[PDB]
RNA sequence: GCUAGUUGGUGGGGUAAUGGCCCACCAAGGCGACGACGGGUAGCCGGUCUGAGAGGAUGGCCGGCCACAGGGGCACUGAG
RNA sequence: GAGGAAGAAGCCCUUCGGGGUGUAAACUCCUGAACCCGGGACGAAACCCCCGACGAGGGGACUGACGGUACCGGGGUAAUAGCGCCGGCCAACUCCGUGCCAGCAGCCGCGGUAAUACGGAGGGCGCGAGCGUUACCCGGAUUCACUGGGCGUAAAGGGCGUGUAGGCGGCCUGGGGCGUCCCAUGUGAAAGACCACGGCUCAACCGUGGGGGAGCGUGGGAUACGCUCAGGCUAGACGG
RNA sequence: UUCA
């Protein structure tokens, strides 16, 4: 564009849209489970991914993924949302933090324990 | 009434003052009108007190009122000597 | 004498009745770190043969780089295809700040302090080619002097 | 904490002799003797063409494992060197060679840089007369690096300083075996140094 | 120093008050090209002396009315509505920038 | 209109050298003439001279080139490898003395129009003045 | 497209002081695409972070200025 | 910390000969963080009092929260290590268990009985009083392109005119100097940032000193270019 | 019919 045009309209700064509206962008947000369903992923995957509807304190009701081998989440299970998309589950943009609130850490896990919230086991 | 007092600079347990000319009503470590010396109460260097008598003499000549301690440092730096 | 650095080797594919037939391509830089570099892009059914040709084509594609205390005598911007490469003269102790492809050309050319930037299409092939051209277009006060004397 | 663990294993990975031990890393046994292949269950298999990154990283791990410093510490020094006027490369080595714990080693008061570190921390060393137990202390040209009088009669200080008798020292230093003193004459040039490191590759590692 | 500006009188419809249009010229902060900007100042004319087309010098003065902080200093050149024209026409265009039109 | 006479001249020079002309004409103008002197003096062009092509005043610019060359494409290297208009109508460019650029670490030249006349980036620096940055050449 | 204290004038009132700051009365004016008006958002700065730079993003702590003291409005006393 | 086996046991891998963990451990010998005992601060020298003049000078006395802390001396025990990762990007590979399940996943993608990608294990790579995760900012992103982009077929030429505002504008002279350029000069608080010395054993954190510029104000100067005013010209334009 |  001519410099004149630039003086006339200038350039437009490009904004960025959040991938995780868990308000205040806050690192995490608290919620209560509404449902604890199971879900089938999109091509070319197949399985029963574990999901939960959470009624966030932010005033939102989003679908959170429950990582780990197995879980212990019922309805009124209060939990912490952190935000992490699940690639094959369109719609799931948050992960549930294991080890906080009613969500148990993953039992028996020995490797990436920081994630999955699993205290270190001692030996003999 | 304007003052010639000490403003604190340094670290915790490590004070270093600036002999300063500031309005009495202003914050201690606030905006001062002029710096005219410095003081290291711990004398960590041979140079723990400089003043510049010429300027200090000026402010006194216009109503500057020194704090008791500011006065002692000023004296020690020959500000009031007259012999 | 001549040191060789392999820029990239790739397995390309052609199609035939019943199945696809392969072939390899290799980019090789050669230089004495004394001011001479050559680029070669050899292709053959096998990697090794590919690299062989690469080297060969390179030695007959040498360029005279006017080093001046480990650096270039002036900035040049060369565009090759949609690839653009920028070369800026730097002082001692800067090193060769450049991406893998142009870096290899430059080091083997005996450049030790240079500033660069890859713009536009970063196709290694075309960037490799833009670099050689840049070095090739470099001139020296002397050269300018003879061009303008007469 | 500065590492603390199997050391003649780091030598093996770098495929080069790192005299971390010292006394034993001389008498055919630093493992780099009849076992110069990296440690691990796969240690003897053929290695693949290391990636440029890999090569820069290994070289940086080499130089840094020599002075036995942490990455945090090591990095800060590099930065200090990038700022400083002059070739941000030789300077960097110079700074490393100025660490007290290192100079203590270069003057042979200790056998290794690890052993030299403990000697400083335990206060058996002195700069310009005053005690100093800071391994990271930077020795400036002109400083005198002696041994605590109260230490001059230490089983270890005698033995090491004894064996130093007759041996020459870095062109930039100067020992006094008798009085157990020494002087940091000048920052060594790269020419004065002679370690298995390609400094440039380290600068490159931190440009990425 | 009290600011002194220079502009054209584009309104003598106020009792002892003239509207002076002042033009500024300067490099654009980011794009460089020299752009032209301007502002109308209400100045003081106690004698109702100055009139349209009048190019004058305006000087920073002690408040005279709300938004009237300048007194006319002197005449630079008289009559020249060519300027008041551009101004007047420009304002006319505005009639055709709403819901209706204004030919051409 | 012509809009930018100076640019028109730089381009005629550019276009002509690209097809290796002997010389090339450019509608004459004082200002343009001052530019040419710098080009001549600098050895970018053999020289120039006023001419009256069909009544009107022009300026024959005599172009320079390197020697014939080896291999395919024996065409001579250009003396004027680059000639770029910097300041232009509607986007004028001015620089202070400390803002005068250094074309190709000195191998090139920048032509400024200062209140002390038209000068090269070095000349200008010497006379300690700045002005409109007309163009760069190398 | 906006405007009636609205824009300007005379006189007054008020204040340390200019001023539609307020009031009488006279004039029709004033502002707007070089956006007025309306809506949204936000204390501003020294500076901080990033960037080769130009830029981009930002004010926590510290220093300067401003604003507020449950929400509005109001004067009194005083150099303030 | 130094020494310490052609290299225990256990665990892992095995072609089954052996290879790993690994000088690592065990042990031997040194040094002694913690602790224990002593000593024990600077920060505080004024106000005031006496002399002298309630001055200048000169004496005198009081006052320490932190703190019995900092530091100093003596004695003195081998004395916490975790966390992430190992398909490519991206440093780091094997066994078993799983069977498109259970699950991983930043992007590309892994799992359908021979999975270096899942879970465990051995080994390995990074950092290490931290490692990881999430969130947000700049970067890379010349991916809003002033520096530094584009629009025939990739996203992009308005369906075409007429023409308002505006932007831009040929060749000579001469005024004026608005833009522009130059010299002086005021301003550019302190912190901060850069540099040089210093003070805490280093550093972090501090002081002290030095250098700096845009911006704007003022005074003076220049006039090539842009601007403006005044003349002129005929190649652009229009007319006959 | 789906995934390679
Ligand atoms: K090209
Ligand atoms: K209107
Ligand atoms: K800012
Ligand atoms: K006295
Ligand atoms: K695995
Ligand atoms: K970004
Ligand atoms: Mg959230
Ligand atoms: Mg499905
Ligand atoms: Mg699948
Ligand atoms: Mg994510
Ligand atoms: Mg999925
Ligand atoms: Mg007072
Ligand atoms: Mg006040
Ligand atoms: Mg105040
Ligand atoms: Mg391949
Ligand atoms: Mg050459
Ligand atoms: Mg081509
Ligand atoms: Mg292109
Ligand atoms: Mg691209
Ligand atoms: Mg440096
Ligand atoms: Mg009035
Ligand atoms: Mg007047
Ligand atoms: Mg050109
Ligand atoms: Mg300027
Ligand atoms: Mg009044
Ligand atoms: Mg009054
Ligand atoms: Mg009003
Ligand atoms: Mg009034
Ligand atoms: Mg305006
Ligand atoms: Mg707010
Ligand atoms: Mg950048
Ligand atoms: Mg950028
Ligand atoms: Mg801001
Ligand atoms: Mg309020
Ligand atoms: Mg409240
Ligand atoms: Mg109230
Ligand atoms: Mg209130
Ligand atoms: Mg009072
Ligand atoms: Mg050991
Ligand atoms: Mg004390
Ligand atoms: Mg008495
Ligand atoms: Mg008395
Ligand atoms: Mg006294
Ligand atoms: Mg008291
Ligand atoms: Mg002790
Ligand atoms: Mg790898
Ligand atoms: Mg994992
Ligand atoms: Mg630490
Ligand atoms: Mg950008
Ligand atoms: Mg984008
Ligand atoms: Mg552009
Ligand atoms: Mg594009
Ligand atoms: Mg299209
Ligand atoms: Mg069309
Ligand atoms: Mg269309
Ligand atoms: Mg038209
Ligand atoms: Mg027009
Ligand atoms: Mg013109
Ligand atoms: Mg001027
Ligand atoms: Mg200035
Ligand atoms: Mg400042
Ligand atoms: Mg120090
Ligand atoms: Mg300073
Ligand atoms: Mg004319
Ligand atoms: Mg069917
Ligand atoms: Mg499938
Ligand atoms: Zn070793």
Q: What is the DSSP string of E34-80?
A: EEEEEEEEEEE-TT----TT-EEEEEEEEEEETTEEEEEEEEEE---
Chain centroid to CA D87: 21
Residue-number span of the structural domain to which E59 is assigned: 1-104
Q: Chains with ≥3 Cβ pairs under 8 A against E? A: A, F
Residue nearest G20 (alpha carbon to C1'): E66
Which tokens in the block code for residue B13? 């347990």
Chain centroid to CA C13: 25
Q: C94: CA distance to ligand 20 center in Å?
A: 8
Cβ–Cβ < 8 Å for F79, C113: no
In angstroms, the Cα distances linking D59 to B7, D9, D55 are 52, 16, 6
Chain F interface, best mutation among E33, E35, E36, by max F CB count within 10 A: E33
> Would you call F40 helix, strand, or coil by DSSP?
helix
State which CATH number among 3.30.420.40, 3.30.1490.10, 3.40.50.720, 3.30.700.30 fits the domain covering F81-138. Answer: 3.30.1490.10
Of C143, C130, C145, C147, give the one whose Cα is nearest residue C76.
Answer: C130
Residue-number span of the structural domain to which A76 is assigned: 1-124
Cβ–Cβ < 8 Å for E58, E20: yes
The domain spanning residue D162 has which CATH number? 3.10.290.10
Please, what's the largest Cα pairwise distance for chain A?
Answer: 79
User: Half-sphere exposure of D168 toward its Cβ, with a 13 Å CA cutoff?
Assistant: 3
Of D102, D113, D173, give the one whose Cα is nearest residue D141.
Answer: D173
Angle, in degrees to the nearest 10, between helices C124-137 and C100-108 = 40
* Structural domains of chain A, count: 1
Which contacts (CB < 8 Å, 24+ apart) does range D82-88 have? D82/D206, D86/C93, D87/C92, D87/C93, D88/C93, D88/D203
Tell me how many degrees the CA angle D141-D147-D152 measures, rounded to the nearest 5. Answer: 155
Q: Count of H helices and E strands in chain A? A: 1, 6
Closest alpha carbon within chain F to A5? F90
What is the C-alpha separation between F68 and C39, in angstroms, rounded? 26
> Would you call F98 helix, strand, or coil by DSSP?
helix
Give every CB contact of residue D31 below 8 A, 6+ residues apart in sequence.
Answer: D8, D9, D11, D12
Q: How many CB atoms lie within 10 A of CB D183?
A: 19
Q: How many CB atoms lie within 10 A of CB F125?
A: 16
Tell me how many degrees the CA angle E16-E19-E21 measures, rounded to the nearest 5. Answer: 155
What is the C-alpha separation between C24 and C51, in angstroms, rounded? 9
Of D79, D106, D133, give the one whose Cα is nearest residue D187.
Answer: D106
Q: Across the strands, what pairs with B32? A: none
Resolution (A): 3.0
Q: How many CB pairs lie under 8 A apart between chains A and E?
A: 9
What is the C-alpha separation between D70 and D64, in angstroms, rounded? 8
* Structural domains of chain D, count: 2
What is the C-alpha separation between E1 and D203, in angstroms, rounded? 57
Give the CA-trace dihedral at C55, C61, C62, C63, to 10 degrees.
-140
What is the C-alpha separation between F10 and C15, in angstroms, rounded? 52
Angle, in degrees to the nearest 10, between helices F5-18 and F30-42 = 40
Q: What 8-state DSSP symbol labels residue A117?
A: T
What is the C-alpha separation between C17 and C11, in angstroms, rounded? 19
* B1-83 under CATH 3.30.1360.30, yes or no: no
* Residues comprising chain F, all counted: 138
Q: How many CB atoms lie within 10 A of CB E24?
A: 10
* C65-139 under CATH 3.40.50.11890, yes or no: no
Cβ–Cβ < 8 Å for F131, F92: no
What is the C-alpha separation between B14 and A119, in angstroms, rounded? 44
Note whether D91 and D117 are same-domain residues: no
Residues of chain E with C-beta less than 8 angstroms from the C-beta of F92: 32-34
Indicate left, alpha or beta for A104 from its phi (over 0: left) and psi (-120 to 50: alpha).
beta
Q: Across the strands, what pairs with C89? A: C114
Q: Residues of D from 19 to 78 whose C-beta is within 7 A of strand H: which are they?
A: 20-25, 27, 29, 31, 34-35, 38-45, 48, 50-51, 53-54, 57-58, 60-61, 70-73
Give every CB contact of residue D67 below 8 A, 6+ residues apart in sequence.
Answer: D74, D96, D99, D102, D113
**Sign, Cα dihedral of B17, B23, B24, B30:** negative
In this complex, the answer to whether residue D4 has its CB under 7 A from any atom of chain H, a nucleic strand, is yes
For residue C89, which phi and psi values (nearest 5 degrees)? Answer: -70, 135
Strand G nucleotides with an atom less than 7 Å from a protein beta carbon: 1, 7-10, 18-21, 26-34, 52, 54-57, 62-65
Q: Is D25 annotated as a binding residue?
A: yes
User: Half-sphere exposure of A68 toward its Cβ, with a 13 Å CA cutoff?
Assistant: 24
What is the C-alpha separation between D36 and D61, in angstroms, rounded? 17
The domain spanning residue A110 has which CATH number? 2.40.50.140
Q: What 8-state DSSP symbol labels residue F47?
A: E
Query: Is C139 in Cβ contact with F79 (below 8 Å)?
Result: no
> Would you call E81 helix, strand, or coil by DSSP?
helix
What is the C-alpha separation between E37 and E21, in angstroms, rounded? 11
Indicate left, alpha or beta for D46 from its phi (over 0: left) and psi (-120 to 50: alpha).
beta
Note whether D55 and D117 are same-domain residues: no
> Which residue has tokens 């549930």?
A96
Tell me how many degrees the CA angle D183-D147-D162 measures, rounded to the nearest 5. Answer: 90
What is the C-alpha separation between D124 and E59, in angstroms, rounded? 81
Residue-number span of the structural domain to which D154 is assigned: 97-193
E91 nearest nucleotide via C1' and CA: G32
* Structural domains of chain E, count: 1
Q: Residue F21: is it exposed, middle or buried by C-beta count within 10 angstroms (0-12/13-18/19+)?
A: middle
Domain coordinates in residue numbering, chain B: 1-83
What is the C-alpha separation between D30 and D7, in angstroms, rounded? 9
Nearest chain F Cα distance for residue E28, angstroms: 10
Cβ–Cβ < 8 Å for C30, C40: yes
Question: Cis link prior to A44 (omega < 30° from 0)?
Answer: yes
Neighbour-count burial for B43-75, b at 16+ CB within 10 Å, e otherwise: eeeeeebebbeebbeebbeeebebeeebbebbe
> Which residue has tokens 């004028």?
F92
Tell me how many degrees the CA angle E30-E34-E37 measures, rounded to the nearest 5. Answer: 95
Domain coordinates in residue numbering, chain C: 1-64, 65-139
Chain A CB within 8 Å of residue F72 CB:
no
Strand I nucleotides with an atom less than 7 Å from a protein beta carbon: 2-4
Chain centroid to CA C130: 7
Residue ranges of F 53-72 with Cβ closer than 8 A to chain C = 64, 66
Which tokens in the block code for residue D172? 């930039």
Q: What is the CA radius of gyration of chain D?
A: 18
Cβ–Cβ < 8 Å for F110, F91: no
Of C87, C34, C106, give the one whose Cα is nearest residue F105.
Answer: C87
Q: C85: CA distance to ligand 19 center in Å?
A: 14
> Would you call E25 helix, strand, or coil by DSSP?
strand
* Residues comprising chain B, all counted: 83
Q: How many CB atoms lie within 10 A of CB F26?
A: 22
Give every CB contact of residue D151 below 8 A, 6+ residues apart in sequence.
Answer: D124, D125, D157
Q: Is D30 annotated as a binding residue?
A: yes
Which tokens in the block code for residue C38? 């050559």
Q: What is the bridge-based pairing of β-strands B2-11 and B65-66?
A: parallel
Give every CB contact of residue B62 below 8 A, 6+ residues apart in sequence.
Answer: B2
Residues of chain C with C-beta less than 8 angstroms from the C-beta of D52: 100
What is the C-alpha separation between A59 and A31, in angstroms, rounded? 9
What is the C-alpha separation between A124 and A108, in angstroms, rounded? 17
Tell me the H-state helices in A43-110.
none
In this complex, the answer to whether residue F120 has its CB under 7 A from any atom of chain H, a nucleic strand, is no
* F3-80 under CATH 3.30.1370.30, yes or no: yes
Tell me the H-state helices in chain B.
53-61, 68-76
State which CATH number among 3.30.465.10, 3.30.160.20, 3.40.50.1980, 3.20.20.70 fits the domain covering C1-64. Answer: 3.30.160.20
User: Half-sphere exposure of D41 toward its Cβ, with a 13 Å CA cutoff?
Assistant: 0
In this complex, the answer to whether residue A43 has its CB under 7 A from any atom of chain H, a nucleic strand, is no
């Amino acid at each position: 564009p001519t410099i004149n045009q630039l003086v006339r309209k200038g350039r437009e700064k490009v904004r960025k849209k959040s991938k995780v509206p868990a308000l205040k962008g806050a690192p995490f947000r608290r919620g209560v489970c509404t449902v604890v369903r199971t879900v089938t992923p999109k091509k070319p995957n197949s399985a029963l991914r574990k999901v939960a509807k959470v009624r966030l304190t932010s005033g939102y009701e989003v679908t959170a993924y429950i990582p780990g081998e197995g879980h212990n989440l019922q309805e009124h299970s209060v939990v912490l949302i952190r935000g992490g998309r699940v690639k094959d589950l369109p719609g799931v943009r948050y992960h549930i933090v294991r080890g906080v609130y009613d969500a148990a850490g993953v039992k028996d896990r020995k490797k990436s324990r920081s994630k999955y919230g699993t205290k270190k086991p001692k030996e003999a | 009434m304007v003052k010639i007092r000490l403003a604190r600079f340094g670290s915790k347990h490590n004070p270093h003052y600036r002999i300063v000319v500031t309005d009495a009503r202003r914050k201690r470590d606030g905006k001062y009108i002029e710096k005219i010396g410095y003081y290291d109460p711990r004398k960590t260097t041979p140079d723990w007190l400089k003043v510049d008598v010429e300027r200090a003499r000026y402010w006194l000549s216009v109503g500057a009122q020194p704090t008791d301690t500011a006065r002692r440092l000023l004296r020690q730096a020959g500000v009031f000597r007259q012999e | 004498d001549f040191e060789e650095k392999m820029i990239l080797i790739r397995r390309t594919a052609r199609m035939q009745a019943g199945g696809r037939r392969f072939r390899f391509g290799a980019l090789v830089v050669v230089g004495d770190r004394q001011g001479r570099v050559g680029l070669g892009f050899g292709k053959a059914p096998e990697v090794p043969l590919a690299v062989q040709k690469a080297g060969y084509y390179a030695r007959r594609n040498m360029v005279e780089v006017p080093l001046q205390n480990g650096t270039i005598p002036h900035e040049i911007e060369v565009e090759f295809g949609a690839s653009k490469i920028v070369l800026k003269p730097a002082a001692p102790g800067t090193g060769v700040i450049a991406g893998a492809v142009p870096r290899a050309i430059l080091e083997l050319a005996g450049v030790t302090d240079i500033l660069t930037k890859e713009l536009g299409s970063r196709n290694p092939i075309n960037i490799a080619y833009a670099t050689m051209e840049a070095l090739r277009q470099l001139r020296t006060k002397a050269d300018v002097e003879r061009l303008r004397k007469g | 904490g500065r590492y603390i663990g199997p050391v003649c294993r780091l030598c093996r990975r770098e495929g080069v002799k790192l005299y971390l031990k010292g006394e034993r890393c001389y008498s055919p046994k630093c493992a780099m003797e009849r076992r110069p292949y990296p440690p691990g269950q796969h240690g003897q298999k053929r290695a693949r063409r290391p990636s440029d990154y890999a090569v820069r990283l290994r070289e940086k791990q080499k130089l840094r494992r020599i002075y036995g410093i942490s990455e945090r510490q090591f990095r800060n020094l590099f930065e200090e060197a990038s700022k400083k006027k002059g070739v941000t490369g030789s300077v960097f080595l110079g700074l490393l060679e100025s660490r007290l714990d290192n100079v203590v080693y270069r003057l042979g008061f200790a056998v290794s840089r690890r052993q030299a570190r403990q000697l400083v921390r335990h206060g058996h060393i002195t700069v310009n007369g005053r005690r100093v137990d800071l391994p990271s202390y930077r020795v400036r040209p002109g400083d005198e690096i002696a041994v605590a009088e109260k230490s001059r009669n230490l089983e270890l200080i005698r033995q090491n300083l004894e064996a130093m008798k007759g041996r020459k020292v870095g062109p930039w230093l100067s020992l006094d075996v008798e009085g157990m003193k020494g002087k940091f004459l000048r920052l060594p040039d790269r020419e004065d140094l002679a370690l298995p490191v390609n400094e440039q590759l380290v600068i490159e590692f931190y440009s990425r | 120093p009290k600011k002194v500006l220079t502009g054209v009188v584009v309104s003598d419809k106020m009792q002892k008050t003239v509207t002076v249009l002042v033009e500024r010229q300067f490099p654009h902060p980011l794009y460089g090209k020299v752009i032209k900007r301007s502002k109308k100042y209400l100045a003081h004319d106690p004698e109702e002396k100055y009139k349209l087309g009048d190019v004058v010098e305006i000087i920073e003065s002690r408040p005279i009315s709300k938004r009237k902080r300048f007194r006319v200093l002197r005449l630079v050149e008289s009559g020249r509505m060519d300027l008041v024209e551009k101004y007047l026409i420009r304002r006319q265009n505005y009639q055709s920038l709403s819901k209706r039109g204004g030919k051409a | 209109m012509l809009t930018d006479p100076i640019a028109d001249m730089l381009t005629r020079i550019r276009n002509a050298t690209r097809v290796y002309k002997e010389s090339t004409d450019v509608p004459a103008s004082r200002f343009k003439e001052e530019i040419l002197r710098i080009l001549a003096r600098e050895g970018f062009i053999k020289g120039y001279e006023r001419v009256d092509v069909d009544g009107k005043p022009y300026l024959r610019v005599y172009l320079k080139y390197g020697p014939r060359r080896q291999g395919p494409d024996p065409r001579p290297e250009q003396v004027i490898h680059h000639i770029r208009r910097i300041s232009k109508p509607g986007r004028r460019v001015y620089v202070g003395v400390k803002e005068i650029p250094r074309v190709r670490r000195g191998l090139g030249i920048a032509i400024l129009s200062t209140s002390k006349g038209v000068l090269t980036d070095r000349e200008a620096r010497k006379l300690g003045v700045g002005g409109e940055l007309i163009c760069e050449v190398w």
